[PDB]
Design a protein that fits this description.
Chain A: The modification Asymmetric dimethylarginine is found at residue 2. Chain A: The modification 5-glutamyl serotonin is found at residue 5. Chain A: The modification N6,N6,N6-trimethyllysine is found at residue 4. Chain A: The modification Citrulline is found at residue 2. The complex is a heterodimer of chains A (6) and B (98). By secondary structure, chain A is an all-beta fold. Chain A contains no helices and one strand. The radius of gyration of chain A is 6 Å and the shape is rod-shaped. Chain B is built from no helices and six strands. Chain B has strands at 17-20, 29-30, 61-62, 69-70, 80-81, 88-89. Chain B has one domain: Zinc/RING finger domain, C3HC4 (zinc finger) (Herpes Virus-1, 2-Layer Sandwich), CATH 3.30.40. A two-stranded antiparallel sheet of chain B has the order 1-2. In chain B, strands 3-4 form a two-stranded antiparallel sheet. Classes of the chains: A mainly beta (6), B mainly beta (98). The interface between A and B is small, with 6 and 17 residues. Strand 1 of chain A pairs antiparallel with strand 1 (17-20) of chain B. The structure holds zinc ion (4 copies). Residues 9, 11-12, 14, 30-31, 34 of chain B line the site of one zinc ion (ZN).
Chain lengths: 6, 98
């Protein structure tokens, strides 16, 4: 599973 | 600009490092800590919005403010409109300030 950064 | 997932954790509302749901058409993303996961899941991961919080069956009705959701057996009476554009909320929220 992937992550994103905000 | 258009992206497929949201910029804030669906559980707590804060930004940062978020795991993205793999369910087709799901835009939800979450802190690992907020899901009580220790590491990003290996391979495919579908978020808790897709399963009924009462029984694990496939969800058909969805809180718009948190990952609580309800299968066909448990959805009646689960959600009410809120003051934010009538968006539906589960019992975890004050409908006047969801
Ligand atoms: Zn969070
Ligand atoms: Zn999802
Ligand atoms: Zn259910
Ligand atoms: Zn909710």
């Amino acid at each position: 599973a992937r992550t994103k950064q905000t | 600009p258009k992206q497929m997932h949201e910029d804030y954790c669906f559980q707590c509302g804060d930004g940062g490092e978020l795991v993205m749901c793999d369910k087709k058409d799901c835009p939800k993303a979450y802190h690992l800590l907020c899901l009580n996961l220790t590491q990003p899941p290996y391979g495919k991961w579908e978020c808790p919005w897709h399963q009924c919080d009462e029984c694990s069956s496939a969800a058909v009705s969805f809180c718009e403010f948190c990952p609580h959701s309800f299968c066909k057996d448990h959805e009646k009476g689960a959600l009410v409109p809120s003051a934010l554009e009538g968006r539906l909320c589960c019992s975890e929220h004050d409908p006047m300030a969801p």
